[PDB]
């Protein structure tokens, strides 16, 4: 079962992705051919792994797990934001924290302090303490909100499902595979491919392909929840 | 130079198993062929065959990996080496892993695993251990 057809897929191009001085898979099946000193998609593999992960996550999300829209790469920030608006989930934009998925019970306390500070803001006690300190609370709140949105609705022993900016946040994968739950990301295409249980080729940079496939997985979650 | 083609065979399979290669390439010999057939029987590898080359024949082996990329061959080692030619009576045959793994004997009845050799009663030169 395909999602988009051959010519609509060749409009956007099915060739992209990365330079020659950096690769090392062992899979000559993913490695397509030398052209312009640069490599190409294997659509057989690509559509195969897409259907594979898609049926996996249909099962998992008719069971009804949950993953959220944290942001690391500038190419995916607004993408993840708008899909957060329409699929409804919370999102996050800027930074990865060292040790969410492993040290979850301390970032839980960070959420608790987020709640405390928002409660202070709501009750409106500001001149009860120094103006400078209230301005520094505004600093705290901007930092805490740009670096944390997902726990505000997680609370619930997160599953190690999805991946944001693989190569530059490899630090996000060992936090996941340590516990070993099936990981997925569109491959950041100069990496060790065969770590991840459910790999899916693609691009590392392109705003267009990344927004497209973020909408694809948004769609997957939407159908899983809809037919729950 | 070359002196130990059987060690070349075995070490090459070991290196390729560690690099997770799919198929191997050697020159050809009767002894190598019989070894390969025994391994294909015992279950370690999928298939071998004889292609050819410029001056002489050549082997090609087809390995056997798990579905989850589990290597089927754990360990591998030559025993009777030039210099120390190790010979074996039926009474004092080697037992690998209590008998799980496999010795590879060379006998009047040809190459035989230890069990087949013991059931025939025979013994002779040892060549390798496998597991």
């Amino acid at each position: 079962m395909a999602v988009v057809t051959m010519k609509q897929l060749l409009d956007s191009g099915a060739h992209f992705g990365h330079q020659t001085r950096r690769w090392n898979p062992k899979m000559k099946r993913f490695i397509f051919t030398d052209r312009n000193g640069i490599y190409i998609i294997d659509l057989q593999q690509t559509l195969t792994y897409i259907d594979k992960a898609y049926e996996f996550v249909k099962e998992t999300v008719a069971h009804g797990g949950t993953v959220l829209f944290v942001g690391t790469k500038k190419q995916a920030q607004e993408s993840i934001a708008e899909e957060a608006t329409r699929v409804g989930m919370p999102y996050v934009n800027q930074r990865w924290l060292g040790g969410m998925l492993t040290n979850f019970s301390t970032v839980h306390k960070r959420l608790q302090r987020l709640k405390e500070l928002e409660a202070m803001e709501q009750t409106g006690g500001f001149e009860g303490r120094t103006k400078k300190e209230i301005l520094m609370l505004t600093r705290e709140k901007n930092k805490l909100e740009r670096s944390l949105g997902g726990i505000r609705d997680m609370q619930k022993v997160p599953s190690a499902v999805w991946v944001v900016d693989t190569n530059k946040e490899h630090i996000a994968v060992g936090e996941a595979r340590k516990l070993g739950i099936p990981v997925i990301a569109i491959l950041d295409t100069n990496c060790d491919p065969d770590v991840v249980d459910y790999p899916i080729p693609g691009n590392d940079d392109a705003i267009r392909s990344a927004a497209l496939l973020t909408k694809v997985i948004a769609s997957a979650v939407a159908e899983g929840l809809q037919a729950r | 130079t070359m002196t130990d083609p059987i060690a070349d065979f075995l070490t090459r399979l070991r290196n390729a198993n560690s690099a997770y290669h799919d198929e191997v390439t050697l020159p050809h010999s009767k002894l190598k062929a019989n070894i390969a057939e025994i391994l294909k029987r015992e279950g370690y590898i999928s298939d071998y065959r004889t292609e050819d080359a410029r001056v002489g024949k050549s082997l090609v082996v087809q390995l056997k990996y798990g579905p989850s990329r589990e290597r089927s061959i754990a360990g591998l080692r030559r025993v009777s080496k030039p210099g120390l030619r190790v010979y074996a009576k039926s009474t004092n045959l080697p037992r690998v892993l209590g008998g799980l793994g496999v010795a590879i004997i060379s006998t009047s009845s040809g190459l035989l695993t230890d069990r087949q050799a013991a059931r025939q009663g025979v013994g002779g030169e040892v060549l390798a251990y496998v597991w």
Binding site: - | G43, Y44, K64, E70, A74, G98, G99, L100
Partner: protein, 180 residues
């Protein structure tokens, strides 16, 4: 229920301008006595603290063992940093033959009849790590027949299967006397 150990206590010291800011370590091994085995290197200023860290970290990092009734399948060489160990099965009624570290490991694991020998790196740390490496190098004959496609009969000899059958008999006896 769990069995737990304390098999190493050294008195460490980081050094700083005032003097020596001492601390305490520990090495803790856990085992159900049935195959689960866990290991932990806990430390603190407090000996109970280090011990409890070792406990919980062992309960994290279990590892299942290919047992047969009360004895291992095959002998094996286990390498760690320099810890060498030559484990080897016994015949039943022999005993848990080892030193201190490996004895703790195997007695917690559930072994009753086994051999062992330390040949390098007398330190308990590396000794334990090497023993663990050996237990990982172990293989079940079932998984062997799996990986090489053949059946258990061509894959194993007869005496091991005798042991299998007789131990299953004793186990069904114990459980059917317990509940039934």
């Amino acid at each position: 229920n769990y069995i737990e150990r304390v098999v190493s206590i050294n008195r460490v010291s980081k050094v700083v301008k005032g003097g020596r800011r001492f601390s305490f370590t520990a090495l803790v091994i856990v085992g159900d006595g049935k195959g689960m085995v866990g290991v932990g290197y806990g430390k603190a200023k407090e000996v109970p603290a280090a011990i409890a860290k070792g406990v919980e970290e062992a309960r994290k990092n279990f590892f299942r063992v290919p047992l047969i009734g009360s004895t291992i399948t095959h002998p094996v060489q286990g390498e760690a940093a320099a810890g060498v160990v030559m484990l080897r099965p016994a015949s039943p009624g022999t005993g848990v033959i080892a030193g201190g570290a490996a004895r703790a490991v195997l007695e917690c694991a559930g072994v009753h009849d086994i051999l062992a020998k330390s040949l390098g790196s007398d330190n308990a740390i590396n000794v334990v790590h090497a023993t663990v490496a050996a237990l990982k190098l172990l293989q079940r004959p079932e998984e062997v027949a799996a990986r090489r496609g053949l059946p258990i009969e061509d894959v194993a000899p007869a005496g091991m299967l005798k042991a299998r059958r007789e131990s299953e008999a004793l186990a069904a006896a114990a459980a059917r006397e317990g509940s039934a």
